[PDB]
Amino acid sequence: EIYALEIQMYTAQKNNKKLKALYEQSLHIKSAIPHPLIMGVIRECGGKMHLREGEFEKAHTDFFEAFKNYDESGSPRRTTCLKYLVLANMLMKSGINPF
Amino acid sequence: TPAMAVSHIMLESYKKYILVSLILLGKVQQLPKYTSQIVGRFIKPLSNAYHELAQVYSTNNPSELRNLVNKHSETFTRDNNMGLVKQCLSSLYKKNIQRLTKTFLTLSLQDMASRVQLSGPQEAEKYVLHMIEDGEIFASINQKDGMVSFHDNPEKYNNPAMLHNIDQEMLKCIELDERLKAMDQEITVNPQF
Amino acid sequence: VENPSLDLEQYAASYSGLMRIERLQFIADHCPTLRVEALKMALSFVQRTFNVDMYEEIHRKLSEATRELQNAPPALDTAWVEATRKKALLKLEKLDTDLKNYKGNSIKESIRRGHDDLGDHYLDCGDLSNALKCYSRARDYCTSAKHVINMCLNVIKVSVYLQNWSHVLSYVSKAESTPEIAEQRGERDSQTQAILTKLKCAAGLAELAARKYKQAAKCLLLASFDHCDFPELLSPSNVAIYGGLCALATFDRQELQRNVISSSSFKLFLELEPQVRDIIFKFYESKYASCLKMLDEMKDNLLLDMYLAPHVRTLYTQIRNRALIQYFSPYVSADMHRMAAAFNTTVAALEDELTQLILEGLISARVDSHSKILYARDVDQRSTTFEKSLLMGKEFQRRAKAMMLRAAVLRNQIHVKSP
């Protein structure tokens, strides 16, 4: 939750390096944890970050699992995450089967 | 030839070997490993001027070769081979014109005179025309524009001419093999070891 | 050699120790006008850590500089020098006493630590040879791998100032092989203490000094940004400059795309120096005009760097040549005026450069100097194969005739007698 808020701050601050470090550090705590929405929030940033770097396949998987978590919780981030999923499906060259 | 002592025939033939190799080829042709030790020990440093000539020839500079020919002129006239060194100078100019084919396609006569160091397009046109006639270069002259057009395409290897050439070259190899068969047979008849 | 874009303050703030001293002396020796500030900063830091020689060298050079400054239109502190000499000698006697005490007690940890402190103080005083001898003797008092790693890092640190790059590489590979091949996995989910980064940077500088730019870049590109501060060898901004230029000069398009551009580890370094990042990206985007413009803008500023300068000619020539190849690679027929304009040079100078590039390099073209067009040359496969085969047959026949006569002379025993 703390890491999710830190990432949320650096998303508006636009500090990519830090977001990469924070997401890579958040992946360790995910091993032994309950099942909230947070697990799908960090992944959304993890997707955007992977688009900023150039890794489109990892962004596609991140946006897919994040969309699943946003489907389990609800809107409004679900539609935007689905838009970023289609964007990652096209940028991957080529997924061409999102729906 | 196997030798224990150095002979003047071997020295003069070695000097003339360097000269002819500088004329025919772009550099000095490597003598076989079975050549006499006295050649590399005595003949080589005795005819030092000739290896010095090849050393200046390798820099592709005509003015420096001219300076070296004027430097040891007495030694070259002493061996009575002055003329072959002039042919080496002319072959260095030819080599410098030949090197233009590898990089240029259409080159100006003035640019050639500047690069080869001939002074004037007139001498460049003379050299190119002589080289085309002697079959040394595969080029054409455009007087109107003052250009030289390098073609570099003698054959496409579809003529019967090549068929007859290959047939003759193969007959030479067959002749050589039959001679080697005769030598091998002659040895097989002789006593064992 | 003049460039006012250099920021002496930040450049001095990034480094430390003899590295700071030698770099400030390099800026002072190679670049005038900025010599004054370089000498002032050098003197101020030479007074720290206690050093006499460096103070005498800098004071002599500052006095000659002040004489030149007075010719255009600090006083010798022998009391501090003698006090420093007395302080250094007495501290060396204290370290000798404690070292002999631990040697008498016979404790591996105490003797090894004593030799390490001894070596640090020898480095502070200004002894280039003895400082290595301390760690060389400290070698024998090791048990665990960690002690050997720290020792090797110290040996490498001193060997950089001694310019023994072969020993640097040897101790780098030694410190890489001793801890069960870098702890095998990576100390589980990465390590807080980045040792591999220091090893790749040291090996990178060693490969750079040995003029092996491809391996130098290959090591530098693998170094992670998490190490951050390292003033004993090289700063991350310079890691980006060194690695960036070396990779641009030696690596090809596919290698630059996979190991430099898509590299996440080096991306941060590319974010530190945007100029190098723009140069690499303009080189990959085929914008050679702006690439050479930025590269020539950097040239005079990079000429002042301590370790980078003796390669600045090679790198730039290697880059330019590669760019010329990358420019002509997709063309069958290219205009020499657009090429000369794209490479910031004249048509005749481009013609000379290209002629040299065809004579030895990767360019397989012919220059049409009349119309100023560079045409790509396509080798006729059949004619070349036939030509070299026919010539081989001729050479074979001549070798056969030669050995036929050799067989004849050896048979008839024809030879020149000695007397």
From Swiss-Prot, chain A:
Which cysteine-cysteine pairs are annotated as disulfide bonds in the entry? none
Compartment(s) of residence: Cytoplasm; Nucleus
- What are this entry's molecular-function GO terms? transcription corepressor activity
Tell me how the protein is altered or processed after translation: Phosphorylated by CK2 and PKD kinases.
Q: Which GO terms describe its cellular component?
A: COP9 signalosome; cytoplasm; cytosol; nucleoplasm; nucleus
Q: Does the keyword Nucleus apply?
A: yes
Q: Which domain of life is it from?
A: Eukaryota
Q: Which UniProt keywords apply?
A: Cytoplasm, Nucleus, Phosphoprotein, Signalosome
Q: Where are the annotated coiled coils located? A: none
User: Which example biological process does GO assign this protein?
Assistant: negative regulation of transcription by RNA polymerase II
State the function annotated in the UniProt record.
Essential component of the COP9 signalosome complex (CSN), a complex involved in various cellular and developmental processes. The CSN complex is an essential regulator of the ubiquitin (Ubl) conjugation pathway by mediating the deneddylation of the cullin subunits of SCF-type E3 ligase complexes, leading to decrease the Ubl ligase activity of SCF-type complexes such as SCF, CSA or DDB2. The complex is also involved in phosphorylation of p53/TP53, c-jun/JUN, IkappaBalpha/NFKBIA, ITPK1 and IRF8/ICSBP, possibly via its association with CK2 and PKD kinases.
Q: How does it assemble?
A: Component of the CSN complex, composed of COPS1/GPS1, COPS2, COPS3, COPS4, COPS5, COPS6, COPS7 (COPS7A or COPS7B), COPS8 and COPS9 isoform 1. In the complex, it probably interacts directly with COPS1, COPS4, COPS5, COPS6 and COPS7 (COPS7A or COPS7B). Specifically interacts with the ligand binding domain of the thyroid receptor (TR). Does not require the presence of thyroid hormone for its interaction. Interacts with CUL1 and CUL2. Interacts with IRF8/ICSBP1 and with nuclear receptors NR2F1 and NR0B1. Interacts with NIF3L1.
Entry similarity comment? Belongs to the CSN2 family.
Name of the protein this chain belongs to: COP9 signalosome complex subunit 2
Name of encoding gene: COPS2
From Swiss-Prot, chain B:
**What part of the entire protein does this chain span?**
211 to 403 of 423
Function per UniProt: Component of the COP9 signalosome complex (CSN), a complex involved in various cellular and developmental processes. The CSN complex is an essential regulator of the ubiquitin (Ubl) conjugation pathway by mediating the deneddylation of the cullin subunits of SCF-type E3 ligase complexes, leading to decrease the Ubl ligase activity of SCF-type complexes such as SCF, CSA or DDB2. The complex is also involved in phosphorylation of p53/TP53, c-jun/JUN, IkappaBalpha/NFKBIA, ITPK1 and IRF8/ICSBP, possibly via its association with CK2 and PKD kinases.
The family line of this record is: Belongs to the CSN3 family.
Superkingdom of the organism of origin = Eukaryota
Q: Which organism is it from?
A: Homo sapiens
Q: In which tissues is it expressed?
A: Widely expressed. Expressed at high level in heart and skeletal muscle.
Per its record, how is this protein called by name? COP9 signalosome complex subunit 3
Oligomer status and interactors = Component of the CSN complex, composed of COPS1/GPS1, COPS2, COPS3, COPS4, COPS5, COPS6, COPS7 (COPS7A or COPS7B), COPS8 and COPS9 isoform 1. In the complex, it probably interacts directly with COPS1, COPS4, COPS8 and COPS9 isoform 1. Interacts with CK2 and PKD. Interacts with the translation initiation factor EIF3S6 and IKBKG. Interacts with ERCC6.
Something else the entry says is: Amplified and overexpressed in some osteosarcomas (OS), suggesting that it may participate in TP53 degradation in OS.
Where in or outside the cell it occurs: the entry states:
Cytoplasm; Nucleus
Q: Which residues form the PCI domain?
A: 1-155
Swiss-Prot record, chain C:
Listed A to Z, the keywords are: Cytoplasm, Nucleus, Phosphoprotein, Signalosome
Q: In which tissues is it expressed?
A: Widely expressed.
Question: Metal-binding: is it a keyword of this entry?
Answer: no
Keyword GTP-binding assigned to the entry: answer is no
Q: Where in the cell is it found?
A: Cytoplasm; Nucleus
Query: GO terms for biological process?
Result: JNK cascade; protein deneddylation; protein neddylation; regulation of protein neddylation
List the GO cellular component terms: COP9 signalosome; cytoplasm; cytosol; nucleoplasm; nucleus
Give the domain note. Answer: The PCI domain is necessary and sufficient for the interactions with other CSN subunits of the complex. Mediates the interaction with CAPN8.
Task: Please explain the role this protein plays, according to its UniProt record.
Answer: Essential component of the COP9 signalosome complex (CSN), a complex involved in various cellular and developmental processes. The CSN complex is an essential regulator of the ubiquitin (Ubl) conjugation pathway by mediating the deneddylation of the cullin subunits of SCF-type E3 ligase complexes, leading to decrease the Ubl ligase activity of SCF-type complexes such as SCF, CSA or DDB2. The complex is also involved in phosphorylation of p53/TP53, c-jun/JUN, IkappaBalpha/NFKBIA, ITPK1 and IRF8/ICSBP, possibly via its association with CK2 and PKD kinases.
Protein name (Swiss-Prot/TrEMBL):
COP9 signalosome complex subunit 1
- The organism named in the record is Homo sapiens (Human)
Q: Which gene encodes it?
A: GPS1
